[PDB]
Design a protein around this ligand. Structure first.
Ligand code: HEM
Ligand SMILES: [Cl-]
Lengths: 5, 386
């Protein structure tokens, strides 16, 4: 899980 | 191979992760998850501490010997002081916008869109309202012409979203980088021909003397700003409406004016805010929850779980639309806190205010959840306005 756009 | 406590992409967990979050918080509030190769923090105080300490918990995984793939070195993946010029430039460009003008045009657009949709028997709130509304909002705010919403656009967005979960599906990495490269091309076209108003024209105007080079790191940062601005409010609007319709008495409380939109919107962000996980690299041995977190390990702040922590919120599993106080973490904290939160709140207040003018609004079919554990939302929310 990496919150990267 | 299954984790004994938490399987974020299990369909039963995706249907409703909050009981699983709660059991995890009660059993191992600081938990080593082998499949995710990360500690998981499910308590509000621990998540807040992680987000407020970049010298200990970094967004730049190069500091623990993990290279940053192309398209991903950006505002999001730099720590102070390297991040600070870009962060200040983005703050300055965002603050130069007229939020009152934005609210006026979004109020009109939402009323027009819902009046058209009320002419239909039913519709998909996600594809037919939320995505249309949030794409309009972010492209007007940035000051750019929107992309076409064709099948390729949808597939690129799905590829980008799924790559947030690439730790559990390694094959998702390369399609995600291709999707970011695709949207970088869009950003480069915008930068070559800035419009008269918006965040992007002001970025260009503020660049001289900002300490920010007009390079690929800036491009990646603008891409992420655009893509989050499009997607995350859509995820939230669907989650929020689904929760209001599913909770007995919640919609009528708003219809009757027994609660205001200020506390209600904040309680919806706490209850079903879309961002589930914020990861950081540990740069120094640290004790959290009595666990020995080591330099070189990853920690993940499960802020969706933290926002239902009973240590912070009394009656946390209840949607209390008048909840006060409400110190939720839905927009992050510290050096990487959300740059779009004022736009996001305008979108939520405008949308709910517009829907409340159709009191007969009700589900017209089952919601469909996106198979994503990092950014949570719906792919379909069948609705009729009555
Ligand atoms: C309900 C809607 C939204 C929610 C819940 C939300 C949530 C968040 C959160 C939790 C973070 C922290 C990331 C981290 O700590 O790594 C963040 C960062 C960010 N958000 Fe939002 N966001 C929303 C809408 C938006 C909008 C509309 C925009 C643009 C107009 C935007 C732009 C950004 C950017 C650029 C960052 C990265 C800041 C940095 O790393 O320095 N977001 N958001
Ligand atoms: Cl690129």
């Amino acid at each position: 899980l990496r919150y990267l756009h | 191979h299954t984790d004994p406590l938490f399987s974020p992409l299990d369909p039963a967990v995706l249907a409703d992760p909050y009981p699983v979050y709660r059991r995890l918080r009660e059993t191992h509030p600081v938990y080593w998850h082998a499949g995710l190769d990360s500690w998981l923090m499910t308590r509000h105080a621990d998540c807040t501490a992680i987000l407020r300490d970049p010298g200990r918990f970094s967004t730049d995984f190069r500091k623990i010997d993990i290279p940053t793939p192309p398209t991903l070195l950006s505002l999001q993946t730099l720590d102070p002081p390297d991040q600070t010029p870009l962060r200040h430039l983005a703050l300055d460009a965002v603050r130069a916008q007229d939020l009152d003008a934005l609210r006026k045009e979004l109020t009109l657009f939402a009323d027009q869109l819902l009046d058209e949709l009320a002419d239909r028997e039913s519709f998909d709130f996600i594809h037919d309202y939320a995505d249309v509304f949030t794409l309009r909002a972010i492209t007007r705010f940035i000051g750019v012409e929107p992309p076409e919403t064709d099948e390729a656009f949808a597939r690129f967005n799905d590829d980008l979203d799924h790559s947030m979960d690439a730790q559990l599906d390694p094959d998702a990495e390369e399609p995600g980088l291709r999707a970011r490269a695709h949207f970088n091309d869009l950003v480069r076209s915008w930068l070559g021909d800035p419009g008269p108003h918006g965040v992007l024209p002001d970025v260009v105007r503020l660049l001289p003397g900002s300490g920010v080079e007009a390079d690929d790191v800036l491009v990646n940062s603008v891409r992420a700003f655009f893509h989050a601005g499009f997607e995350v409010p859509s995820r939230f609007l669907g989650n929020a409406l689904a929760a209001l319709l599913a909770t007995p008495g919640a919609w009528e409380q708003l219809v009757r004016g027994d609660v205001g939109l200020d506390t209600a919107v904040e309680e919806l962000i706490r209850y079903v805010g879309p961002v589930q996980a914020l990861a950081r690299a540990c740069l120094q041995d640290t004790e959290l929850g009595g666990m020995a977190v080591k330099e070189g390990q990853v920690v993940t702040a499960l802020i969706g779980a933290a926002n239902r922590d009973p240590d912070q919120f009394p009656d946390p599993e209840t949607l209390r639309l008048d909840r006060k106080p409400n110190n939720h973490l839905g927009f992050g904290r510290g050096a990487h806190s959300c740059l779009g939160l004022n736009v996001a709140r305008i979108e939520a207040h405008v949308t709910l205010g517009a829907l409340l003018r159709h009191p007969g609004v009700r589900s017209a079919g089952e919601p469909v959840v996106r198979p994503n554990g990092t950014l949570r939302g719906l792919s379909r929310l069948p609705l009729t306005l009555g």
